[PDB]
């Protein structure tokens, strides 16, 4: 999963090319899934408890 | 008694070397204070060169 994209998405052929290794500034890791605090996957807010 | 003497003799040498550390520090004081005035009197002179 990508969390924050690198700062060239406005000139990126995302209709004909996918989001590969170099387009993601940071991915989701085990630090991001804090047990107790709200988490936001794409479109949805979760409440990992 | 032999050790007693070398002790008394070392004791005396201290008295002397200490008296001389003193007459060499009280002198540092006088000379540092002398330089302090001269450096301040220096300022007074420097200001005059421009005061005129």
């Amino acid at each position: 999963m990508p969390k924050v994209l690198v700062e060239n998405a406005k000139n990126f052929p995302r209709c004909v090319l996918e989001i590969s290794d170099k387009e993601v500034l940071e991915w989701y890791t085990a630090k991001d899934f804090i047990v107790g605090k709200p988490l936001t996957i794409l479109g949805r807010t979760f409440f990992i408890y | 008694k032999s050790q007693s003497d070398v002790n008394k003799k070392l004791e005396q040498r201290l008295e002397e070397v200490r008296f001389w550390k003193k007459e060499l520090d009280d002198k540092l004081e006088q000379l540092v204070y002398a330089t302090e005035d001269l450096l301040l009197y220096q300022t007074r002179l420097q200001k005059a060169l421009e005061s005129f």
């Binding site: 085990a30 899934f33 047990v35 988490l39 979760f46 409440f47 990992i48 408890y49 | -």
Partner: protein, 148 residues
């Protein structure tokens, strides 16, 4: 240890040059000499700038004595202004033993030409070892549950 900026406005490489020198004072007859060390790839005719002589200080005939020589000073000699930056630990010892307070140091300045000829430093930091394989091996058969 001294340096002096002259000019270089007719060149394409920079607008100002720095010429590294060491200035010597002699206690034999109160004499000075200025020596320019040989830079390896500079086109300037490096060498000896001023021979051993009693260099005149002003127009009335006085020469430079060591009483007015510090670490940071901008003495001018025959039209060239030298900014001394640093001494060695013998010149310092002599100067402080006479009453002279040594000034704070300055770095050296740098000639833009010779430092832009510094050839590249051929190296690569080694890549990491935590690739797909090691992350597959040290983190196999273990997954985290999260109830949300």
């Amino acid at each position: 240890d001294a340096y002096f900026q002259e000019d270089v406005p007719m060149s394409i490489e920079e607008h100002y040059r720095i010429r590294q020198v060491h200035i010597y004072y002699y206690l034999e007859d109160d004499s000075m000499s200025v020596i320019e060390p040989v830079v390896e790839n500079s086109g300037i005719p490096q060498g000896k700038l001023i021979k051993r002589q009693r260099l005149s200080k002003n127009d009335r005939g006085d020469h430079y004595h060591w009483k007015d020589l510090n670490r940071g000073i901008n003495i001018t000699i025959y039209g060239k202004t030298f900014r001394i930056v640093d001494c060695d630990k013998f010149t310092q010892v002599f100067l402080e033993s006479q009453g002279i307070e040594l000034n704070p140091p300055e770095k050296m300045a740098l000639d833009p030409y010779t430092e832009l000829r510094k050839q590249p430093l051929r190296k690569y930091v080694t890549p990491t070892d935590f690739d797909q394989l090691k992350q597959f091996l040290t983190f196999d058969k273990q997954v985290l549950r999260f109830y949300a």
